[PDB]
Amino acid sequence: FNKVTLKFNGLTVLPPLLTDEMI
Amino acid sequence: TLEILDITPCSFGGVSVITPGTNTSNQVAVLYQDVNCTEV
Ligand SMILES: *[C@@H]1O[C@H](CO)[C@@H](O)[C@H](O)[C@H]1NC(C)=O
Numbered sequence: 001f002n003k004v005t006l007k008f009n010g011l012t013v014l015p016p017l018l019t020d021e022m023i
Numbered sequence: 024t025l026e027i028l029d030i031t032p033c034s035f036g037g038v039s040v041i042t043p044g045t046n047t048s049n050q051v052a053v054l055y056q057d058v059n060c061t062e063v
Pocket of ligand 1: 059060061
């Protein structure tokens with residue numbers, strides 16, 4: 001989790017159904 | 024004046040309807056995606 005590092009005009013992102021705790 | 028202001032867009036989202044089948048009941052509940060209920 002620590003290794004991996006990375007809404008205005010009508011674009012949205014939906015959260016996943018399963019949270020990281022469930023995985 | 025010499026003030027500092029921030030511009031963030033007005034809230035928007037896609038309303039969706041959650042429903043059991045009409046063969047069971049009729050009441051439904053809506054869901055406002057990406058919305059803080061202080062506005063609704
Ligand atoms: C919704 O707005 C209120 C305004 O006081 C704020 O306190 C609250 O944290 C907001 N909720 C979210 C999820 O941002």
